[PDB]
Design a protein around this ligand. Structure first.
Ligand SMILES: C[C@H]1O[C@H](O[C@H]2[C@H](O)[C@@H](O)[C@@H](O)O[C@@H]2CO)[C@H](O)[C@@H](O)[C@@H]1N[C@H]1C=C(CO)[C@@H](O)[C@H](O)[C@H]1O
Ligand SMILES: C[C@H]1O[C@H](O[C@H]2[C@H](O)[C@@H](O)[C@@H](O)O[C@@H]2CO)[C@H](O)[C@@H](O)[C@@H]1N[C@H]1C=C(CO)[C@@H](O)[C@H](O)[C@H]1O
Lengths: 460, 460
């Protein structure tokens, strides 16, 4: 396999959970991640790891105490759904030896599970008194100095609940609607901003994560988001990875509003093309999405996540059932974006036998400039990676069929590698393809759903 | 002085010329560069280095042969205005030794100085026959292989001239008007595109430049522009620098049209604030500029260049007569953008003494998160750099007067450094400032033109 200079290895993200998945994940995470690292996964998005209101039953999004990573006895348990902090720290060390960066699912927008009610003057009853043992232990003046503030999480830490404002509050400068659920956190209050900057430092520099997936971040004040990202980046030696879950109509607008070069965003709109792909009738010449937009460099592409694919389909999203490998090929091999392999696809749906080779194709071959194919048809999409002049053996000519016909079809494509012989890394088409002196070869693809993708890369 | 980690040192650019300046620059450049390296200049925008139509009298923008860097006798001289290519290579070696990156001023849009005319069938005479001895010497099949194409630069390498298209030609997809001057090069021709890629690799990997100032590039086909940048970036092991001279009304839309993360652009709009500043009557609360836009991270800021500041004022631009040190402070110490120090200001106008301390202020202290100041007045702008937690002694509190009243005014500002004693690195205000437990100090600034900027930094 071609050997890539480490600093140039493509980042391939793996979402290491789906809904209700993997109770006790932390203990098992080293084993799960060992083969994934061999394939070419270089980062995993872990489920929200902080204590949530429903204890071991919580997936993590009903977050209670951001400073309690399965360490303190609260909400009925010490461990989270996934395990104790010790098991998490050992998981992080294992992933570290394996070369994998772990991203934290931070839930900034809301809190749930108050320890007691309060009477808020001029308002009434609210579930706003939060005790937060983990905060008491780690958010101390000794640890954080200038970022430490003596204040209690009660109703003055929140904008409000049930889309009603608490006295003297306002929702903030939010790109989406401000209120989603729970007790909406007031990031217009200075002491909360500073504590969150301290927590971001703790997660990277002390706990040992390498980046964040930012839950519902478009419901959160945009100025705080920018200032917290900017603070954590300046505060860390590594280049920390930030990806927004900004599930809005205009994700380009959201990124321009936050206005930090460190923030990426999930490509929600590219999925609509995979929805069309699943029909088996999509015109394979047209592709939209963030990854073909003026923010394409800041795109994090995916096929499904725990909201889009979930038993019962609770958010009513159209499903991506068919042609899923062609969808994964599209996100994995093209030059732009950081792609996400979804655990439910790899694991539960059992797509690992075919996905394994696509992760390797991205890992060891998808390098050099990218080229679109003037010869795309209504039924076949093709794409080229030149490869690396420095690394002979890189480059790829990929083809995907959006039809279930049977048989093959071939396309004359310029690989930009003269007089080079290729072969199909996927094992879907047999034989070789030899290019001519100007770089062109005749590459086939199978016109089926089940095997309708091919990734031709140069022979050893 | 604070010791900044090598990979974190701010980029500070110096445009190493102005109009008609420095005949024989190459021999004198290492001498000029050594003290500037000490102050903190890290990159130098060098004048267009390729042979021009006007020989030793060519600043370099009437470019004739891009492969002739002063190595071949054509246009009446072997050496350019700035020297031989031997003397250029020696200057680049010395810059390497000083840790200074060199940026090549590439002139892609047009050619001038045709050797003979051609009778274009169905058009008439045109000055299109380019002999190009440098191209004969270096653009060879043995040197470049796949990128080498056998063709001569005659009328079929250009789109037209005098805003008139040649037969079969179109102007291309250009953001600005396509025609500026000379023989407009056809970048919609494959062979011309492929040759320019070869040349880009040559400049970086063989001559030893580190980046590019892209002349008149809004007039050049946007798709070539993106493809060239991306090709050169992939073909270079180092992180190559690219700044566009896109002198258009909507620089944001230009950078979105080219759509590569590697391209920066000059912030022409911010200069309009410095024109206002120069009057002595600017409202210092208000600032525009690309550096304050959604493309701020891709801004290259400056006060003047060889087009805006020139004897005779050839393009009718308003001049920044006064408050020039305040302008420089503004572009040098704020967190976004890469700033440019102009040789005409440093040298001819004698600003070196004061610019020396503001360059050192950027090199050594301008790190960590930036913060705007809520208490800006019509007369005073202020701004804070929080500094680095890992490097004690960094950070700064800058203020700039836009008034010439005399005396001093003090401003209560959060420096984000508790219990810290500051002093004015510019020496314009005597004494020290001591911040309280929460980081706030009372920072003075002189209300004058000639001394009205202060840059408070931590005592050592
Ligand atoms: C579940 C999901 O809901 C919201 O997303 C909606 C978008 O706002 C809309 O644009 C709409 O078109 O569809 C989306 C689904 O209705 C919300 O904005 C998202 O942040 C949210 N996803 C995360 C939020 C959670 C915490 O409240 C979790 O429940 C969820 O699993 C997260 O992925
Ligand atoms: C000198 C300058 O001319 C053009 O610039 C104009 C802009 O296009 C307009 O938007 C307008 O506002 O004013 C500008 C000045 O008239 C052109 O676009 C620029 O590229 C050009 N600058 C470079 C071009 C040259 C030719 O190679 C050189 O003469 C000049 O020194 C370069 O800096």
């Amino acid at each position: 396999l071609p050997q890539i200079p480490p600093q140039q290895v493509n980042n391939t993200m793996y979402q290491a959970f789906y809904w209700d998945a993997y109770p006790g994940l932390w203990a098992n995470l080293p084993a799960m991640a060992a083969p994934l690292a061999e394939r070419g996964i270089t980062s995993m998005w872990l489920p929200p790891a902080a204590k949530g209101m429903n204890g071991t039953f919580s997936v993590g999004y009903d977050v209670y105490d951001l400073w309690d990573l399965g360490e303190f006895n609260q909400k009925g348990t010490t461990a989270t759904r996934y395990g104790t902090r010790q098991q998490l720290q050992q998981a992080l060390s294992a992933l570290d030896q394996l070369g994998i960066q772990a991203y934290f699912d931070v839930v900034f927008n809301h809190r749930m599970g108050a320890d007691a009610q309060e009477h808020i003057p001029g308002f009434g009853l609210a579930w706003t008194e939060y005790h937060l043992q983990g905060r008491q232990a780690h958010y101390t003046q000794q640890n954080w100095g200038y970022l430490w503030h003596d204040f209690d999480w009660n109703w003055t830490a929140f904008n409000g609940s049930d889309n009603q404002l608490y006295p003297g509050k306002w929702w903030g400068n939010t790109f989406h609607f401000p209120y989603l659920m729970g007790e909406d956190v007031d990031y217009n209050r200075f002491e909360v901003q500073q504590e969150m900057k301290a927590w971001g430092e703790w997660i990277i520099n002390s706990v040992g994560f390498s980046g964040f997936r930012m839950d519902a971040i478009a419901h959160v004040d945009t100025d705080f988001t920018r200032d917290w990202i900017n603070h954590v980046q300046w505060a860390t030696s590594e280049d920390v990875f930030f990806v927004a879950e900004a599930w809005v109509s205009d994700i380009n607008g959201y990124l321009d509003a936050v206005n930090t070069p460190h923030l990426r965003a999930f490509d929600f709109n590219l999925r609509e093309d995979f929805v069309a792909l699943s029909s088996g009738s999509k015109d394979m010449r047209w592709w939209g999405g963030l990854v073909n937009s003026q923010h394409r460099d800041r795109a994090v592409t995916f096929v499904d996540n725990h909201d889009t694919s979930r038993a019962g389909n609770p958010y009513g999203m159209p499903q991506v059932i068919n042609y899923k490998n062609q969808a994964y090929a599209y996100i994995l091999l093209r030059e732009h974006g950081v792609p996400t392999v979804f655990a439910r696809d790899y694991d539960e749906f059992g797509m690992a036998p075919t996905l394994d080779k696509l992760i390797e194709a991205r890992r060891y071959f998808a390098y050099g400039p990218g080229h679109e194919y003037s010869g795309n048809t209504e039924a076949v999409y093709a794409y080229v990676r030149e490869g690396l002049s420095t690394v002979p053996g890189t480059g790829l000519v990929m083809l995907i069929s959006g039809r279930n016909w049977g048989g093959q079809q071939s396309f004359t494509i310029n690989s930009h590698q003269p007089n080079t012989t290729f072969y199909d890394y996927t094992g879907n088409v047999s034989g070789t393809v030899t290019t001519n002196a100007q770089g062109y070869g005749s590459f086939p693809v199978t016109m089926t759903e089940s095997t309708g993708w091919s990734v031709w890369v140069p022979q050893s």
